[PDB]
């Protein structure tokens, strides 16, 4: 198994760059609007403390270039919305794909487009941590880059990258401005919760392993999921939710082993280590794998 | 730092679905040209023992169905080109990027679009093992799949894929239809050489680790090129040339770090174990990013 992310080409094809004075960010193309965060308005005194209602009435559509490359798009309307500036421009995007905008939920995967200068750089994927960020790989300029799934050549965005936070870990908003935890864009260093493990991918995980004949944890035990969700909490393990419970139902059906009692086997696993086994070849339990990334490899 | 794949979308604008019987697998479509694994003409009693002369020579254009999503396109020519069929169409691919086809050294890196009945699925990033495998994520259907490298908007074709060996690693050709190591494309159980680590990737990842604020796996020591490569090879590391210490001469330059210092460490690493401590989240020593990987990444 391994991390795979989606084909990015309808994404690609979306990318544009905007930019205020000398300030670059990338931004996305759908339709005649495009989407890019709202601090492109800011100067390097502004993002200190930037009142961005105040910096945005200053403002005018003839002050925003937007480039498809080197081909200028003329603005024709700005707003913002909350920490996005949607720019109106003249010219719908002939490829902008069939979408959806969506929030996620911590444990979720997406693919990342990097971009710099309205030019994709690399593809990979990632998974919203619980405590609301990112393990990216992000220089200077790369905000505006976007997160995205793909459903049956239905782009689903769910993330627009803002931050990296000083230990290294990124943060951005949904795709109508809305920060993922509680981080807000201004030029300061602001510090994450503490994180914890994504329960439901690590048994996404159990159940892969099953799948390839890899079961020597599986016990004779089951427990109650109120039970399950009290220990996990005393190992740094996320609860799991009705939802959680609900997507891990097909690799469930598919292996035979009800949900519960899979909770029971990491249960033990988390009470007394693996004693050096291994499981699907590695010493490690991984997080970063969902129900639905098992099924899809 | 993350395991980083080249966009895709001057690829998937190549890939179509080719039948021949009922055997259908992926092909890329350059100008009027669609490039595929020779075995669509084989049916499940053709793979065991093929000969492709004679096979291909009993096929004509119309045996060949081309798909671009909906759209057929005519095949009005075709030939043979060691383990890769080229099939001349009636209609040119607008999307056709510049490109090149290359033949990849053992340790260099290079992008998988993995693809199912000519459309794609996921994309990856692979090294090419020393033994000539790729530790890849392939299922029936996906022979064809591509694999490539980017560079200023020309696409460098590097891999076709052919094969999965019983150890669940993969094979293929490059795009003149040569494979990558001792295989062939038969439907029998193949072995491959032992394989061996990408030294000079290692290197490049731990230099990774320091450019990304990780330094505990460095000591005060250092080594001889000779010392290092005795004991490398002892654990079945790939030898470290004088040309792979310069090409890790920008990441030195960048952290502070002579290359045999930083072999030094890899030397301990080695000999020591990881004592359950973890470089960038791993808990094994990487050796998928080239020096080439790092340098893109990081700056
Ligand atoms: C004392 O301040 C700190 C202390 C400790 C850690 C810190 N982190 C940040 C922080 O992240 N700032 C934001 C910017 C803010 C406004 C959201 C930022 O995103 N820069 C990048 C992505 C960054 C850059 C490196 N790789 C990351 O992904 C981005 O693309 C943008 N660049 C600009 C440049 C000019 C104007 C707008 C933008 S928006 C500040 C900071
Ligand atoms: C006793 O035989 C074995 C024993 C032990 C391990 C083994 N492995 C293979 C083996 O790989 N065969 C080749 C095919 C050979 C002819 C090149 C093959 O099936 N390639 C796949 C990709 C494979 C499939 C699973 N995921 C992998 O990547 C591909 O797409 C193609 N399918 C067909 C189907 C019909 C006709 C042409 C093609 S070409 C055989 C084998």
């Not at 030019?119 to 405590?131: F, I, K, L």
């Not at 109508?176 to 030029?187: C, I, K, L, S, W």
């Not at 997080?287 to 098992?294: C, Q």
């Amino acid at each position: 198994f391994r991390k795979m992310a989606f084909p990015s080409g309808k994404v690609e094809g979306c990318m544009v760059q905007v930019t205020c004075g000398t300030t670059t960010l990338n931004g996305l193309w759908l339709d005649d609007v495009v989407y890019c965060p709202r601090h492109v308005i800011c100067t390097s005194e502004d993002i200190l403390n930037p009142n961005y209602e105040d910096l945005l009435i200053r403002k005018s559509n003839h002050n925003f270039l937007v480039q498809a490359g080197n081909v200028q798009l003329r603005v024709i309307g700005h707003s913002m919305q909350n920490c996005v500036l949607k720019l109106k421009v003249d010219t719908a995007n002939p490829k902008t794909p069939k979408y959806k905008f969506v929030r996620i939920q911590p444990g979720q995967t997406f693919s990342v487009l990097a971009c710099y200068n309205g030019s994709p750089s690399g593809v990979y994927q990632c998974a919203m941590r619980p405590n609301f960020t990112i393990k990216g790989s992000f220089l200077n300029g790369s905000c505006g880059s976007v997160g995205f799934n793909i459903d049956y050549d239905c782009v689903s965005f769910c993330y627009m990258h803002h931050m990296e936070l000083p230990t290294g870990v990124h943060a951005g908003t949904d795709l109508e401005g809305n920060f993922y935890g509680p981080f807000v864009d201004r030029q300061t260093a602001q510090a994450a919760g503490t994180d914890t493990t994504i329960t439901v991918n690590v048994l996404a995980w159990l159940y892969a392993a099953v799948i390839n004949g890899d079961r020597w944890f599986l016990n004779r035990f089951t427990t109650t999921l109120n039970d399950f969700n009290l220990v996990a909490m005393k190992y740094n393990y996320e609860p799991l939710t009705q939802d959680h419970v609900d997507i891990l139902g097909p690799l469930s059906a598919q292996t035979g082993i009800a949900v519960l009692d899979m909770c029971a086997s990491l249960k033990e696993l988390l009470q007394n280590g693996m004693n050096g086994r291994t499981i699907l070849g590695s010493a490690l339990l991984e997080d970063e794998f969902t129900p639905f990334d098992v099924v899809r490899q």
